[PDB]
Design an enzyme around this catalytic site. Structure first.
Site, PDB file in Angstrom:
ATOM      1  N   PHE A 184       8.014  12.731 -44.679  1.00  0.00           N
ATOM      2  CA  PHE A 184       9.196  13.575 -44.899  1.00  0.00           C
ATOM      3  C   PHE A 184      10.475  12.804 -45.296  1.00  0.00           C
ATOM      4  CE2 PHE A 184       6.475  15.696 -41.620  1.00  0.00           C
ATOM      5  CZ  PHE A 184       5.895  16.623 -42.461  1.00  0.00           C
TER       6      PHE A 184
ATOM      7  N   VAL B 201      13.242   6.499 -49.406  1.00  0.00           N
ATOM      8  CA  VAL B 201      14.208   5.395 -49.342  1.00  0.00           C
ATOM      9  C   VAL B 201      14.527   4.926 -50.738  1.00  0.00           C
ATOM     10  CG1 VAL B 201      14.734   3.061 -48.442  1.00  0.00           C
ATOM     11  CG2 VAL B 201      13.477   4.692 -47.001  1.00  0.00           C
TER      12      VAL B 201
ATOM     13  N   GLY C  81      10.554   3.862 -51.808  1.00  0.00           N
ATOM     14  CA  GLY C  81       9.334   4.447 -51.267  1.00  0.00           C
ATOM     15  C   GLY C  81       9.508   5.800 -50.623  1.00  0.00           C
TER      16      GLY C  81
ATOM     17  N   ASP D   3       4.047   4.460 -35.197  1.00  0.00           N
ATOM     18  CA  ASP D   3       3.644   4.353 -36.604  1.00  0.00           C
ATOM     19  C   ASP D   3       3.567   2.890 -37.029  1.00  0.00           C
ATOM     20  OD1 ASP D   3       3.006   5.491 -39.137  1.00  0.00           O
ATOM     21  OD2 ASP D   3       5.063   5.756 -39.718  1.00  0.00           O
TER      22      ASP D   3
HETATM   23  C1  LIG Z   1       8.528  -0.395 -48.917  1.00  0.00           C
HETATM   24  C2  LIG Z   1       9.603   0.510 -49.486  1.00  0.00           C
HETATM   25  N1  LIG Z   1      10.729   0.596 -48.541  1.00  0.00           N
HETATM   26  C3  LIG Z   1      10.916   1.493 -47.494  1.00  0.00           C
HETATM   27  C4  LIG Z   1      10.019   2.650 -47.288  1.00  0.00           C
HETATM   28  O1  LIG Z   1       9.588   3.228 -48.278  1.00  0.00           O
HETATM   29  N2  LIG Z   1       9.787   3.097 -46.036  1.00  0.00           N
HETATM   30  C5  LIG Z   1       9.217   4.455 -45.867  1.00  0.00           C
HETATM   31  C6  LIG Z   1       9.969   5.441 -45.045  1.00  0.00           C
HETATM   32  C7  LIG Z   1       9.884   5.612 -46.525  1.00  0.00           C
HETATM   33  C8  LIG Z   1       9.900   2.264 -44.811  1.00  0.00           C
HETATM   34  C9  LIG Z   1       9.364   0.875 -44.801  1.00  0.00           C
HETATM   35  C10 LIG Z   1       8.652   1.957 -44.059  1.00  0.00           C
HETATM   36  C11 LIG Z   1      12.043   1.136 -46.796  1.00  0.00           C
HETATM   37  C12 LIG Z   1      12.581  -0.020 -47.423  1.00  0.00           C
HETATM   38  C13 LIG Z   1      13.656  -0.920 -47.285  1.00  0.00           C
HETATM   39  C14 LIG Z   1      13.786  -2.006 -48.152  1.00  0.00           C
HETATM   40  N3  LIG Z   1      14.900  -2.761 -47.818  1.00  0.00           N
HETATM   41  C15 LIG Z   1      15.401  -2.135 -46.774  1.00  0.00           C
HETATM   42  N4  LIG Z   1      14.709  -1.024 -46.402  1.00  0.00           N
HETATM   43  C16 LIG Z   1      15.014  -0.141 -45.283  1.00  0.00           C
HETATM   44  C17 LIG Z   1      12.861  -2.187 -49.205  1.00  0.00           C
HETATM   45  N5  LIG Z   1      13.049  -3.179 -50.142  1.00  0.00           N
HETATM   46  C18 LIG Z   1      12.283  -3.397 -51.289  1.00  0.00           C
HETATM   47  C19 LIG Z   1      12.772  -4.355 -52.168  1.00  0.00           C
HETATM   48  C20 LIG Z   1      11.983  -4.295 -53.272  1.00  0.00           C
HETATM   49  C21 LIG Z   1      12.073  -5.033 -54.564  1.00  0.00           C
HETATM   50  N6  LIG Z   1      11.038  -3.372 -53.020  1.00  0.00           N
HETATM   51  C22 LIG Z   1       9.914  -2.971 -53.864  1.00  0.00           C
HETATM   52  N7  LIG Z   1      11.203  -2.787 -51.784  1.00  0.00           N
HETATM   53  N8  LIG Z   1      11.834  -1.347 -49.362  1.00  0.00           N
HETATM   54  C23 LIG Z   1      11.744  -0.322 -48.506  1.00  0.00           C
END
Ligand SMILES: CCn1c(C(=O)N(C2CC2)C2CC2)cc2c3c(ncn3C)c(Nc3cc(C)n(C)n3)nc21
Length: 287
Positions: A19, A22, A15, A130
């Site tokens: 700024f 991840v 995502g 946030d």
């Molecule tokens: C939801 C996507 N995402 C993000 C993320 O964009 N941000 C914003 C700052 C850019 C933070 C959540 C506000 C962080 C993380 C993250 C994840 N695991 C550890 N972290 C730390 C994760 N896992 C997963 C697994 C799967 C299959 N998806 C789709 N997402 N998605 C994330």
């Protein structure tokens, strides 16, 4: 604690947010496909101002150790923050996908965990700024964690609020009125936003029911851009509020309306919110 870029294998983009970006990576120093999968945060565009802010964010995360706070793993020095990987992604996406299987008692289990993680931030005098379901991650069906600290600030030693006005898009539909009017952030403005999180949970992320969709309906979709904030301020001052979500019990909507008090000092504490939520959970379960 120190990760080498050469062993960070890209898997997918997870995502983007204020700024930051991840990614999912495998940290495989043995190059035999046995290393663990981690989440890696980097700046979308490097500037000296964003780098100093990112270094402060890293120090904030490293200082937090709580079951409902995403785990810091280290750094990769193009600064990157390495965190544990949580397989279910955001609570916003998870809830939207599993709405038929997640009942109210489960929503309250998640609510209680967010309250406990927020109270822990409060003990360190950190202001999240946030809180939103898009910023909460799902470790498993029974556990959520606050998953990003990109806008987190440390209160001054002698004041109960911090004034900031960041350029970029601010999440105005989650903001307390004093944050909109005076750029004042505090534990009490995190409680206001927690009320919006609780609203999001009980709407099950139904598109037309999002805080931006509901507030834009109340303000008028014809409203310019700079004028949206002006009209939102007036709406909140006049006690205009997000409606009770479909199926939400009165007792739960009352928690939201109490968090949404215009009087900053009258909002509940995160400790009292956890007590109240746990009491309701206990009532619903019988035990
Ligand atoms: C939801 C996507 N995402 C993000 C993320 O964009 N941000 C914003 C700052 C850019 C933070 C959540 C506000 C962080 C993380 C993250 C994840 N695991 C550890 N972290 C730390 C994760 N896992 C997963 C697994 C799967 C299959 N998806 C789709 N997402 N998605 C994330």
């Amino acid at each position: 604690t120190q990760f080498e870029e050469r062993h960070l294998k890209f898997l997918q983009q997870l995502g983007k947010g204020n700024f930051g970006s991840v990614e999912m990576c495998r940290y495989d120093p043995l190059q035999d496909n046995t290393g663990e999968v981690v989440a890696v945060k980097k700046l979308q565009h490097s500037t000296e101002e964003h780098l100093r802010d990112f270094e402060r964010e890293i120090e904030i995360l490293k200082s937090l150790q709580h079951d409902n706070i995403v785990k810091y793993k280290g750094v990769c020095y193009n600064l990157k923050l390495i965190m544990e990987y949580l397989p279910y992604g955001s609570l916003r996406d998870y809830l939207q996908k599993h709405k038929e299987r997640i009942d109210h008692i489960k929503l309250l289990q998640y609510t209680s965990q967010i309250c406990k993680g927020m109270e822990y931030l409060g003990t360190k005098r950190y202001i999240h700024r946030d809180l939103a379901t898009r910023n909460i991650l799902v470790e498993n069906e029974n556990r959520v964690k606050i998953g990003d600290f990109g806008l987190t600030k440390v209160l001054p030693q002698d004041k109960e609020y911090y004034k900031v006005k960041e350029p970029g898009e601010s999440p105005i539909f989650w903001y307390a009125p004093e944050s909109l009017t005076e750029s004042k952030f505090s534990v009490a403005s995190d409680v206001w936003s927690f009320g919006v999180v609780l609203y999001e949970l009980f709407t099950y992320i139904e598109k037309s029911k999002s805080p931006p969709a509901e507030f834009m309906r109340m303000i008028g979709n014809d409203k310019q851009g700079q004028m949206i904030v002006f009209h939102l301020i007036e709406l909140l001052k006049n006690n205009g509020r997000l409606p009770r979500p479909d199926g939400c019990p009165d007792e739960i909507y009352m928690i939201m309306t109490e968090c949404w008090n215009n009087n900053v000092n009258q909002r509940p504490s995160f400790r009292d919110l956890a007590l109240r939520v746990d009491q309701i959970r206990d009532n619903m379960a019988g035990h």
